[PDB]
Design a protein around this ligand. Sequence first.
Ligand SMILES: [Mg+2]
Ligand SMILES: [Mg+2]
Ligand SMILES: [Mg+2]
Ligand SMILES: [Mg+2]
Lengths: 49, 49, 110, 53, 250, 99
Amino acid sequence: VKKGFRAAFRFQKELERWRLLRCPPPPVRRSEKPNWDYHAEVQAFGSRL
Amino acid sequence: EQLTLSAEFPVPLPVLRQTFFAVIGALLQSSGPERAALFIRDFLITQMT
Amino acid sequence: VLVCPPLRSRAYTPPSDLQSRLESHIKEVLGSSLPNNWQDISLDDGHMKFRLLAGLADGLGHAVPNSRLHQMCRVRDVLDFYNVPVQDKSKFDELVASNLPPNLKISWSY
Amino acid sequence: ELVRVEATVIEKTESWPKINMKFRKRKNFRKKKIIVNPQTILRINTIEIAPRL
Amino acid sequence: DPVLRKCELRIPVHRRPVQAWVESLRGFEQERIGLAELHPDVFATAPRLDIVHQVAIWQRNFRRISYANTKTRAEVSGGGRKPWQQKGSGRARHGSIRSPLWRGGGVAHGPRGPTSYYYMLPMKVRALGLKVALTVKLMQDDLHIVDSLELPTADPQYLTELAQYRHWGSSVLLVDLTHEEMPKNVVAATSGLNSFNLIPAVGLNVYSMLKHQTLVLTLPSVAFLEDKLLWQDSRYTPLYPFRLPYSDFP
Amino acid sequence: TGRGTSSRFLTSVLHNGLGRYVQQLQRLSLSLSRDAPSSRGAREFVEREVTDFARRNPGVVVYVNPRPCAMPRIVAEYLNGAVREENVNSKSVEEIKSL
Ligand SMILES: [Mg+2]
Ligand SMILES: [Mg+2]
Ligand SMILES: [Mg+2]
Ligand SMILES: [Mg+2]
């Protein structure tokens, strides 16, 4: 048992990657995910075009 | 697709198609025929290249 | 069973009637009817400096920091120092209330 | 006068990493460089001619 | 009745003195009760942060003793005989089962025994560091000169609220002239507080000043500190240890 | 490395330059810490350059989230559905602005 938590922290990230590949997550609409404001998104839609 | 409001995600194609033309309709009312004609040329006529 | 006065803000804005209040204190402390060249009266006397600065802090509410006392050589310096505003607003706080474009959004999670 | 060709700038990007590893005795796996270059993409729009031969 | 203090020692003619507000702790609002002068050579030295770095590191390192240890191949149990003969076996040549190459063998280059890190900085250099630290706190508005440490009540809560009222830092270091005579009220209030610490004047050091946000000095201590530090300037080298009798030195 | 990696042909998202050019980037997210030496450069970028960048590019929605953080990070999302993520740990204002 080596001293330190940084290697343990890194490995948790890789276990996350492996799990995603084997069991892909079901799709979700972007509204549910963070960083969403409906009013601002609509205005940018027009200006984009 | 991101801005659509519906009860099912991913949005079914008939629902997605309908919202697309509704947007063109809203553009027609706001800015009139000449603008919309450019819109159809740029995004729909291009697809026959 | 003592009690504590509520905390204050640390923001100070130069009062409009700065000249009137400043000179009025000077005449009272000097008691000499505003001699000409009043702006250049030396503050080297210890007793004079305490009375002028102590009274001003109580009334206005703003006091000279310990670092800046040695610079207050003449009455002009006291006049100059009190005419600069002090605001405690954060640089972020100014940014929020600065007429941000429509496509910029900010949120404070602290 | 004869010919006019017009184009448009579509994308400004960088290349994928390219590996350069010189041949030397005691090569080693860490004596290596990665080269990435900037790139740009143009779309040709029109070609026009005029009767001035 | 303003409290006005003047430096006992002679200020250089070319240097103007510096001043600070005298305060008292008897009430929440007795912020200003006097005006005081401080010797420029103490509280207005050049801002040298390299010297502050040296004295802080000296304090931390001159006490260090490390107790890490390892055994060499000589001190591990057993290992006397030659395991097998040089030729014929077809194994690698070996002469002891306790060499560093073997499992359970000795360590080739490991820590050896208790080791000390002792050294001493020159006395003038250590004295200079104290002046620079005092200057830094004043110029950054973290120093508060006070006439005395007397307190109205011994409740610890009162002292904490007072610090909040006057915009002090989360950690406060309080200095008094001597240990034996420190007021009873202060001792009871501080003893129960982790971040408010009370020390005598002779215990002042660069390291504690950096650790604590704001410094509080009583007026008698200010004269005490001024005397000792300025003596280091304008002195001879020692003929023999200063604790021995001298013509004009305590 | 070519035989060890995938490849593709040159293309454009929706014939970008034929009729009208449309900017593909549509969203930026930046996370910060109030008081942390690592994120000092990102803080200055918000103070100076964030607003000006938003005006020059009006089709991009920008989100700024101060919170207790260990590494400041930027997330960029595009119309075709791609997502890209970059660490901004202890970088200068000029580095972030050019990025
Ligand atoms: Mg032996
Ligand atoms: Mg033998
Ligand atoms: Mg041997
Ligand atoms: Mg062993």
